[PDB]
Write a protein that binds this ligand. Structure first.
Ligand SMILES: [Ca+2]
Ligand SMILES: [Ca+2]
Ligand SMILES: [Ca+2]
Ligand SMILES: [Ca+2]
Ligand SMILES: [Ca+2]
Ligand SMILES: [Ca+2]
Ligand SMILES: [Ca+2]
Ligand SMILES: [Ca+2]
Ligand SMILES: [Ca+2]
Ligand SMILES: [Ca+2]
Ligand SMILES: [Ca+2]
Ligand SMILES: [Ca+2]
Lengths: 151, 151, 151, 151, 151, 151
């Protein structure tokens, strides 16, 4: 009859306070953080990791709407990249990426892997209203994603 | 021409040095860290998060072997739990499971969800040679897993 | 001018990361791998070959110290055997050997070529603190050795 | 332009490979080596010097935890000693000590400067779980510490 | 009595079948594989290692004849290279080489260390009728060598 | 009684003989070595390490006089460098320095971080009569410093 479940849930109940108290927004199972600073892609991921998150992914399409309409009028990094090999893309969190449906989320003609002035290709993806591969060294803001068993 | 890919690599290169320099061991795409201290399940996860990792998962069975022979004669936390709801288990990183082999790796009669004296059920999993659900407040060592596009 | 090299170096520099990332230890020019599993002598060699190595040899005596103190309290296969002809021993990597120097490394009364209960002689050598010829079918751990032009 | 920094970074990037390839472990700025052999205090220091290091020091307390939990259940020399004059201790690397701190790391009643059977006092410090001054001629293992501008 | 030598021989007897079944040719103690594809020097070596071999060496001169007349009208990598230091050559398998009988095996004016159009020197050796150092990035076929106690 | 302190002192007494026998000069607690050859900054440091020393530092100003008048009419490396980040200087031995101090020891307009012809900045310091940051690849002589509990 000694139910310490109150304490267990209390611990989770507290964890989400720290998140929303730091302006993490909840959406369909995950917590998302839209950054206020702008940093490179690698530097952006080091942040999401420090906060136990990764650069957001897209398991669905309505998820992209949440981002886009939250980042409409804004370029925000995400967790896609084809560094290791120029051909294959892959999410940094672990999600395998359904190349099939991943179409439409790219710009009308994208990815292009454009050659930038400072001798860089494009191996990192950001979002304004559809994805665009970009030079990773460029300092954009970003969005982290975090999973929870909380609803 | 002017290819900073040398600079791009060099950076990833460096990232892996920091890992193995802190005794992260590589195995089939991911890096694993076997802790030297012992802490509760959440405290163990707060650590793996701090290092941009999560408590190891099992996408395969040969993966579990790697753990076992590195954790043989040792109980190590992992990222499984049926906390949110007592029935459903789920990995903390995101990996879906449930046959999904998800079997044989448990003890001969496990999980049992035993009722501990002070004063909790069992909602966290560790490994000695096969999984066992355990009271989360208990301070065991753990194993983190980290993804890379490096091989 | 245009000096790749780096790309060269970069390439060699990467090769050693994969090794130590898989827990290969460096010693006086060579890389050594001390196994975590236990397998027969041939199965141990099939592994060392797959990883571009062979079961360690002894060009020197200080080398044996490195092994012994790394495998102290442990029986580890090595690349010696007199299978082809029961009299002559020979290293599997290619190194020619001199029983002259190879003496002292054997037990006080060794090799013995003992007859085991199963119809095997002893044609394979392992180490605890000094060599002992052993039945090859027996599943001991092992040590591989790998050469490099890296220091 | 023509920037050899790569080459400069490649040089350092190589230096750390040589270290971890020989089982130097990184911790909060420094590299630490936990020996596999056991030797006297001076002989232990002659080694750390040969490898451009000195017998580990303790600028902090979290450092001692790193040592202790890597040497837990193990006696390891360190770079403290009161030879020159029996009263004052001093680190061999150069680090100044004698804080109101530096206490608590000792046994319940330590240092004692015990008189050993082979006419030796105790002028050297080792660690099992807290410091103890010891006869320097005694052959313990040791830990070296090395500094770097690498993180 | 119970003589498992039949099984021991059968295993060796089987090992050579897999080799010649894959077109490994025997010569004076060793097995040699002449590749059907063409790959760089490093890519070529990863193959020979995977197959428990190394890029062929020359312990003798009649060995070179076997290679040359098996590859007459063909450029084949071999296990020589002066990568580590531009001056010293060394075999990748381990064989030390007198570097005094080595003369005669080189082209009439070789090695030259020619500067190629792409920013590479020549640090790898192939054979047409006598050795020539070559740019390692160049995609030639190759020959592996494997040792055995079989005759 | 049986006081092996004679043997203990004799060992230290021997260490200093080896030093001055190799022309190490004593000054206010430390031993200094002024090299007879000239080598790069890194090559110079590898030496001081081999001799259980590091490139000299300056805890005081009267110390600098000893160096300057011992190296007057001579450029000698020291253990300062602003590698890692172009801004911060730091001693290679470990000494934190009186950045508030450390002025006056530099040239009238120094450091300058001049851009050298072979694409190098200046990240290493030598001394003629006052400090000057210099290209590390340049081969100057040097001075090592060594600590002792001997006076
Ligand atoms: Ca790309
Ligand atoms: Ca683009
Ligand atoms: Ca449960
Ligand atoms: Ca249980
Ligand atoms: Ca035998
Ligand atoms: Ca035997
Ligand atoms: Ca004392
Ligand atoms: Ca004592
Ligand atoms: Ca060459
Ligand atoms: Ca040529
Ligand atoms: Ca500088
Ligand atoms: Ca200057």
């Amino acid at each position: 009859e000694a139910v310490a479940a109150q304490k267990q849930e209390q611990k989770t109940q507290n964890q989400v306070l720290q998140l929303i108290a730091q302006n993490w927004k909840y959406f369909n199972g995950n917590f998302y953080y839209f950054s206020r600073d702008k940093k490179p892609w690698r530097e952006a991921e080091k942040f999401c990791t420090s906060q136990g998150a990764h650069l957001a992914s897209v398991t669905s399409q309505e998820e992209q709407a949440f981002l886009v309409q939250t980042t409409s009028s804004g370029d925000h990094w995400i967790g896609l990249t084809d560094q290791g090999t120029e051909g294959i893309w892959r999410w940094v969190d672990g999600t395998p990426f359904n190349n099939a449906q991943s179409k439409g989320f790219w710009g009308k003609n994208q990815p292009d892997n454009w050659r930038h002035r400072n001798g860089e290709r494009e191996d990192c993806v950001h979002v304004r209203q559809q994805w665009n591969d970009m030079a990773c060294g460029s300092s954009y803001p970003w969005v982290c994603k975090k999973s929870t068993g909380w609803s």
